[PDB]
């Protein structure tokens with residue numbers, strides 16, 4: 001009926017901010033080669049204050065060379081004694097975010113680790129100090145090379161923590177002058193981190209935040225008892241239609257109301273990875289076409305604004321938040337300076353399901369809500385009003401509300417699938433840029449000679465690595481192949497996902513069905529070495545081991561194979577070829593209907609080999625194991 005908002009008996013918890021994740025894995029891959037001005041516009045919609053999503057927090061993967069959901073991300077230490085703080089795109093992204101919002105909060109978290117840290121095992125806790133050394137390197141490099149202060153460091157994404165590791169990490173951070181960096185643990189479930197903190201005083205002192213994933217708006221008693229800040233450090237992960245926007249809206253409010261969580265962080269920041277990779281289009285917005293410039297300011301962007309434009313980390317929740325009589329919820333926050341923000345959500349069940357967890361039915365129906373401002377809020381006479389309706393009307397500023405009759409009270413008619421933000425703040429804005437170009441499929445003729453002497457990013461555009469890591473490579477000692485693309489892992493990472501046994505990078509249009517792929521290849525390992533080119537590759541990311549298609553392999557022992565699968569279990573054709581290590585060969589693979597052919601140096605090696613049809617997927621290149629190999633003069637022409 002009536003809902004009292006009041007600060008006379010004190011405040012609720014401090015609000016820590018809303019954010020999103022770039023990484024786990026390569027979710028920002030296709031954003032880097034957007035042409036201007038579109039790249040900058042996308043970044044504004046994400047990070048520019050009083051504009052779009054206006055995010056408070058950016059969390060990024062600390063790349064570990066392993067597959068981490070939609071690709072691999074490059075590590076700062078591929079090998080022992082290797083350090084490089086200019087690989088990948090997270091450095092660039094953090095700097096772009098910081099340029100727009102100097103007060104943005106930055107977080108790092110590893111999903112995978114380079115294999116050498118395991119000292120013979122696929123386990124990062126074999127040598128605690130070595131693993132902590134590696135992670136602290138990353139934080140120091142952020143500061144020294146990019147002028148970035150990392151605010152929070154995590155442990156091992158959705159994988160076991162080791163209490164001694166966490167203690168060693170704190171000790172090493174302090175030793176390296178990073179006392180200001182805080183620790184969040186364990187980026188998995190509420191247990192066992194929560195009970196561990198109650199039983200171990202030394203662990204309790206070193207953990208600043210309990211970060212739990214997909215908590216379904218609830219926490220657990222042990223986490224409440226800890227007295228630590230509680231964050232949903234990975235949530236959302238739902239297609240960014242109106243359904244996803246509804247999920248985001250509902251959990252933004254109710255994570256605090258139901259679970260005492262004062263930060264929620266969406267996976268992922270922006271969908272800039274091929275949509276047919278796992279969890280396609282599950283970012284706050286969509287930018288999956290750098291070749292066209294087409295992007296989509298999806299509804300979750302405006303859902304974010306309803307909170308982010310009108311709150312900041314350091315504000316406090318009131319004690320007076322809760323559910324509405326007929327469904328939906330309200331939170332309220334102040335800044336201790338006289339401002340007040342009220343965020344109301346009435347998300348229907350059928351239009352707000354997150355993928356994790358699925359909620360049993362709950363009813364939402366038309367209702368009236370009367371709010372009465374008691375305490376210091378009574379004095380307020382005026383409120384700006386922002387309104388969104390999902391299904392569609394986004395972030396529309398309505399007529400100001402006047403509180404004149406001394407009552408300190410007001411009333412609203414609420415329907416379903418609505419958001420209202422009522423705030424004293426006058427700074428709100430629905431940021432706008434002209435529409436970007438229409439969507440267009442990946443170019444049906446595409447080439448890359450990798451001839452770039454000082455590349456802005458460490459890898460050629462559009463190549464999305466799914467196992468292994470591929471990089472621009474310069475070889476001064478060669479003229480024709482001075483600039484190539486090289487696979488650089490020489491051992492399997494400490495994996496997070498189930499990486500393939502062969503390295504692979506995919507590119508192009510998953511819809512492609514008939515296609516001709518060509519590439520110069522160079523095998524660096526004598527006798528045992530092998531490489532391939534491929535087409536119709538149908539799966540990647542967390543499922544890269546499942547990939548089928550047509551794979552044309554050549555080996556340094558003078559053999560070739562054509563397979564139906566990346567794992568090489570199924571043979572379409574096999575035979576001998578004049579192929580050795582350390583020599584450049586040109587491979588061609590043509591696929592049309594039921595039949596494929598392969599060329600070696602422009603000469604037919606096999607033809608009219610029967611393959612599964614229909615079938616469709618990306619073009620790809622790769623190596624037999626985790627081994628050095630180079631590629632040059634890539635080309636594909638295709639039809640869908």
Ligand SMILES: *[C@@H]1O[C@H](CO)[C@@H](O[C@@H]2O[C@H](CO)[C@@H](O)[C@H](O)[C@H]2NC(C)=O)[C@H](O)[C@H]1NC(C)=O
Nearest residue numbers: 012013223224225227256257258259260261319
């Ligand atoms: C966590 O939030 C819960 C609410 O979800 C708080 O628990 C109580 O909530 C009921 C209604 O659900 C209120 O009537 C009580 O006033 C709340 N208790 C107290 C002591 O305020 C709880 O406060 C929060 N836990 C904390 C802050 O540790």
Ligand SMILES: *[C@@H]1O[C@H](CO)[C@@H](O[C@@H]2O[C@H](CO)[C@@H](O)[C@H](O)[C@H]2NC(C)=O)[C@H](O)[C@H]1NC(C)=O
Nearest residue numbers: 312334335336337338339340380424425426427
């Ligand atoms: C609401 O919040 C705004 C934003 O901080 C407050 O305005 C600022 O007040 C500080 C002093 O506390 C000044 O140094 C800033 O220059 C002000 N900024 C702007 C944009 O005005 C404001 O005082 C708060 N209270 C009310 C009633 O608006």
Ligand SMILES: *[C@@H]1O[C@H](CO)[C@@H](O[C@@H]2O[C@H](CO)[C@@H](O)[C@H](O)[C@H]2NC(C)=O)[C@H](O)[C@H]1NC(C)=O
Nearest residue numbers: 512513514515591592593594595613638639640
């Ligand atoms: C890919 O190639 C196959 C084989 O050439 C095409 O399938 C043929 O299409 C023609 C004309 O549409 C038909 O007359 C044939 O009977 C089809 N053959 C088979 C085996 O189905 C297919 O249309 C091509 N697809 C694209 C997108 O180019």
Ligand SMILES: *[C@@H]1O[C@H](CO)[C@@H](O)[C@H](O)[C@H]1NC(C)=O
Nearest residue numbers: 326327361362363364365366
């Ligand atoms: C939801 O609640 C309203 C009012 O109580 C009721 O009329 C309606 O039938 C309910 N819907 C369902 C599916 O129970």
Ligand SMILES: *[C@@H]1C[C@@H](O)[C@@H](O)[C@@H](CO)O1
Nearest residue numbers: 024025068069234237267
């Ligand atoms: C959290 C980790 C991230 O990389 C994704 O795998 C996501 C999928 O829902 O879960």
Ligand SMILES: [Ca+2]
Nearest residue numbers: 449451483632
């Ligand atoms: Ca070249």
